[PDB]
Design a binder for this molecule. Structure first.
Ligand SMILES: Nc1cccc2c1CN([C@H]1CCC(=O)NC1=O)C2=O
Ligand SMILES: [Zn+2]
Length: 306
């Protein structure tokens, strides 16, 4: 099944689901707290799960559930210098309250809503909400067919499809930001097709020499998409692109299934042979009656396109 990765079941069903809808207006200037450790570009309709281990973060996120459940996800240009000029609001839609070592913990799931331009050290961003072609759709929903025949799994609005594509393409974060800056769906669908056009193989960040896999190997195991944010037990948020065949990847260890992001499967660290840096995880179903038996979930972070 493909709902289950989207469920972040590894975290826990726990308690608390918020079916409210909180949506601002066009050219509206808001004030939205920034969560200090999130460094991931987010996109309307893109899910984000978090484990907040730190008391101040665990206070703001608690006082959010009381207010609008909505915070700001910055689209950092430099990141090492909190440089950003766009972002997307996040609205919390699940929740949890744990305790481990007398540390109060908080597990949340959020979802992108609205983009915006960027106008007690919590840090609060004043933002201008930004405002919201079947031809191009076809020509994308096709060349997606030629990458994973599986691609029912795709949205129908020109405005939602364009974000699906923005979240699921293996592109430079530079390109992700370019796509968020676009103020039109048609225009956003036209940059996408021109990006899938000039795509190629993905070399590892560190040596920039060994191809590790290609666009053609990509395949979806989740309804939300081949690409997805999953969080480890640390609290670190990983961006995981699933594929069928990755070349030049040794394996370290012996399979495990604690905290597996995909129910039913087991993971094992993989390692670039060229510089030995950890590239992601190879997977292996826990039962001989599941398909595909073995796939890879690589990290975006480790992969520099050719
Ligand atoms: N237990 C442990 C300790 C240190 C790092 C990590 C883990 C588990 N994990 C990942 C592995 C892949 C998966 O599907 N689930 C996870 O959560 C990590 O990245
Ligand atoms: Zn390498």
């Amino acid at each position: 099944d493909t709902s289950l990765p989207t469920s972040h079941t590894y975290l826990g069903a726990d308690m608390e689901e918020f079916h409210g809808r909180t949506l601002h207006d066009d050219d509206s200037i808001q004030v939205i707290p920034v969560l200090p450790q999130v460094m991931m570009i987010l996109v309307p309709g893109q899910t984000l799960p978090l484990q907040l281990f730190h008391p101040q973060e665990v206070s703001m996120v608690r006082n959010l559930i009381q207010n609008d459940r909505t915070f700001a996800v910055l689209a950092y240009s430099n990141v090492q210098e909190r440089e950003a000029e766009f972002g997307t609001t996040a609205e919390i839609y699940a929740y949890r309250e744990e305790q481990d070592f007398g540390i109060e913990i908080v597990k949340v799931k959020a979802i992108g809503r609205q983009r915006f331009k960027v106008l007690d050290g919590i840090q609060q961003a004043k933002v201008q909400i930004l405002p919201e072609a079947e031809t191009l759709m076809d020509r994308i929903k096709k060349q997606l067919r030629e990458w994973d025949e599986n691609l029912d799994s795709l949205p129908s609005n020109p405005i939602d499809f364009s974000y699906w594509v923005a979240a699921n393409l293996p592109i430079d974060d530079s390109l992700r930001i370019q796509l968020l800056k676009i103020d039109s769906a048609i225009q956003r669908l036209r940059c996408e097709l021109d990006i899938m056009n000039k795509c190629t193989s993905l070399c590892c960040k560190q040596c920039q020499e060994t191809e590790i896999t290609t666009k053609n190997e990509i395949f979806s195991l989740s309804r939300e998409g081949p690409m997805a944010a999953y969080v480890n037990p640390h609290g670190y948020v990983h961006e995981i692109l699933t594929v069928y065949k990755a070349c030049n990847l040794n394996l370290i260890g012996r399979p495990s299934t604690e905290h597996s992001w995909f129910p039913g499967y087991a993971w094992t660290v993989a390692q670039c042979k060229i510089c030995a840096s950890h590239i992601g995880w190879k997977f292996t179903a826990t039962k001989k009656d599941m398909s595909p038996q073995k796939f890879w979930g690589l990290t975006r972070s480790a992969l520099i396109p050719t």
